């Protein structure tokens, strides 16, 4: 297919979300992220591992 | 920390702030994932990315 | 693994008897297997000292 398949308008493929806030308890590590799903694009959470 | 109620992950809309993830300590989502991926993929090969 | 995992402790001998009354609608079956308390963590606790 040649049309209506690819954005062709300059958007990322891989997105890295830095944690908004983090805490490091000596038993557990907690981080909070806010992820913004574009305005039109969608993603599946089969991706989005934790690095 | 998956099934621990105290250390419960949160996936919720920024505006709503109502957690859409609930874990009730009876679900075993670790053994669940193990069995799922074992019954889908032929786990004789090693994938270093997810171990 | 759509199930309600219930771990019932076993003294190092003999038999045991579980469970009370409910509905049992849309039930699917059972799955039993013996575990060791030393190897099994306590339960879904923030930290297990034992």
């Amino acid at each position: 297919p040649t049309h209506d398949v690819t954005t062709e308008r300059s958007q990322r493929l891989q997105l890295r979300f830095v944690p908004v806030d983090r805490e490091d308890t000596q038993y557990s590590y907690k981080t909070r992220f806010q992820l913004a799903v574009g305005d039109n694009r969608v993603l599946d959470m089969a991706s989005t591992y934790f690095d | 920390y998956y099934n621990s109620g105290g250390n419960l992950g949160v996936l919720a809309g920024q505006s709503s702030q109502l957690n859409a993830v609930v874990d009730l300590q009876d679900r075993n989502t670790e053994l669940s994932y193990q069995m799922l991926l074992a019954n889908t993929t032929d786990r004789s090969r090693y994938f270093s990315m997810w171990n | 693994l759509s199930a309600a995992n219930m771990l019932y402790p076993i003294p190092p001998n003999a038999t045991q008897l579980p469970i009370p009354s409910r509905n049992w609608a849309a039930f699917r079956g059972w799955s039993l297997t013996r575990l060791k308390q030393r190897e099994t963590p306590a339960l879904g606790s923030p930290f297990d000292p034992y």
Binding site: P1, H3, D4, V5 | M35, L36, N39, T40 | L1, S2, A3, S31
Partner: peptide, 28 residues
């Protein structure tokens, strides 16, 4: 897009179709 078949790869002059939506894999 009203003709959703335009989004599929074309084998010849027809799109590559098929299949089945949904999964029932659950046991154990």
């Amino acid at each position: 897009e009203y003709n959703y078949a335009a989004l599929a790869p074309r084998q010849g002059s027809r799109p590559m179709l098929s299949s089945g939506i949904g999964t029932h894999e659950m046991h154990g």
